[PDB]
Amino acid sequence: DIVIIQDELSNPVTSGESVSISCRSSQSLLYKDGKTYLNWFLQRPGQSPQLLIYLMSTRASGVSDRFSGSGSGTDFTLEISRVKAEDVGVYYCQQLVQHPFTFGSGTKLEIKRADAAPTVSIFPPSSEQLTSGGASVVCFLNNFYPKDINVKWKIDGSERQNGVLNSWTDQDSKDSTYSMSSTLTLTKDEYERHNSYTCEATHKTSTSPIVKSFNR
């Protein structure tokens, strides 16, 4: 089979500048008809891949003119002349000159924007859950930048680390922010033996954490 490899972007790109995404193949993709069989895709989280360029240089219907494709028979480059926040996602190249058509491992693009503090929101367990016998405390740190963030759970003033589960989203396509979810799962027996519950966010915005808490 033909093997295809892609490069990586070092760091978040600056808005307005140009970005190059490169791809190389173990064999020539130039076919005997003079066309080069290479596709470029953009895949967003939870969506199917979107075809951007085929035949290595022809833009798909409706694709922004900021995207252009070029290359030789083994080295190919996708160009984003004026990158925008809507361009974040994972880019794939693909060869279609010989079966099986193979893809590269993908190249992730993140964009830089102004620093933003997380919007913290804590939720006590619902009555429906307590009836079942569970007690989950949920904390949302939403629309912050950049992605480097830590979260700390304190029960009545003592740090809590057992029973906490986290989930992070990829960069948002509209405002270039990140969001995280932190859920503390306890027993209906354990939640009732404490009064204060706090979720704290440590971020590059502040020296000291941002705290949202509640007392049962």
Add this chain to the structure above:
Amino acid sequence: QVQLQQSGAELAKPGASVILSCKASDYTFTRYWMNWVRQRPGQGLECIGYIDPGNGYTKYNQKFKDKATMTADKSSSTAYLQLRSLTYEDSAVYYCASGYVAFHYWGQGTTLTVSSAKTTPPSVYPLAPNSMVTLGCLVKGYFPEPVTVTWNSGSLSSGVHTFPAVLQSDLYTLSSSVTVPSSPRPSETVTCNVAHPASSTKVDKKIVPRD
């Protein structure tokens, strides 16, 4: 527009077979090649094979050679992918793609899970608590993936953050959040809609203030 509509998520046991479907509308089904590709969780894309819908002629990637069988029924304009002797490694998202331009139009995502574990529906819990109040729904203890979460039947797609699921004791847990002004809520209703195709379950939870 050219449309490819895909089968719902399925849960199957090791050794069994499953048939996924891809239905073509608003274009001549016989004209274009149909491609089948697989994307395993966290991994990249991999071509399974392709079929000509006019004669049933197929070409397979040898990695999926004896495991997969592509067929086409012209009367219903539907392509079929049979996966035999399923393994845990076959748990993945399966896409169909067609068009004059190859891989132009996709649709898709049939999440296939092979785990010998029994399908369990989720419990949906409301998360009730300024300028912008934040609400949410906790979707806990379901199997297998996926769960699709909407708010007010897609009307509030702005300000929504549906987080990736976490696996714990062989069950998944997911959380979704929505942010609206203080003016509409609680004066106007906010409902989270959770669909779990593997169990044919739909759950709607209206978010109501605490007392």
Add this chain to the structure above:
Amino acid sequence: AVGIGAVF
């Protein structure tokens, strides 16, 4: 079958 972009 008819198409471009791939060598079927």
